[PDB]
């Protein structure tokens with residue numbers, strides 16, 4: 001080669017995504033206490 | 049007078065109850081009730 005080119009290029013990389021949190025009692029049952037009492041019998045699904 | 053409450057009881061190895069938490073009392077009790085432990089480590093916890 002007898003010449004050269006100074007090239008600038010872009011590389012786009014993801015780093016993080018949105019941090020989400022879920023309340024089980026609001027999602028599965030909302031505000032009803034009967035569903036909350038029945039959901040208490042399902043153990044540690046929501047802790048997991 | 050008894051009211052509709054959610055409580056967590058600590059059962060001894062002999063079967064007796066040795067400690068209790070009223071989950072509606074203060075934010076610390078709500079933090080303890082969101083987990084299943086009477087001891088909470090240092091950190092920030094989302095509470096139900």
Ligand SMILES: *[C@@H]1O[C@H](CO)[C@@H](O)[C@H](O)[C@H]1NC(C)=O
Nearest residue numbers: 001002003004005006007008
């Ligand atoms: C290299 O290329 C540049 C851009 O076209 C030009 O100005 C320059 O004269 C070239 N150099 C040679 C030695 O040909």
Ligand SMILES: *[C@@H]1O[C@H](CO)[C@@H](O)[C@H](O)[C@H]1NC(C)=O
Nearest residue numbers: 059060061062063064065066
């Ligand atoms: C459990 O009961 C045994 C037999 O009475 C007693 O020696 C022991 O101290 C008890 N344990 C606790 C943790 O209270």
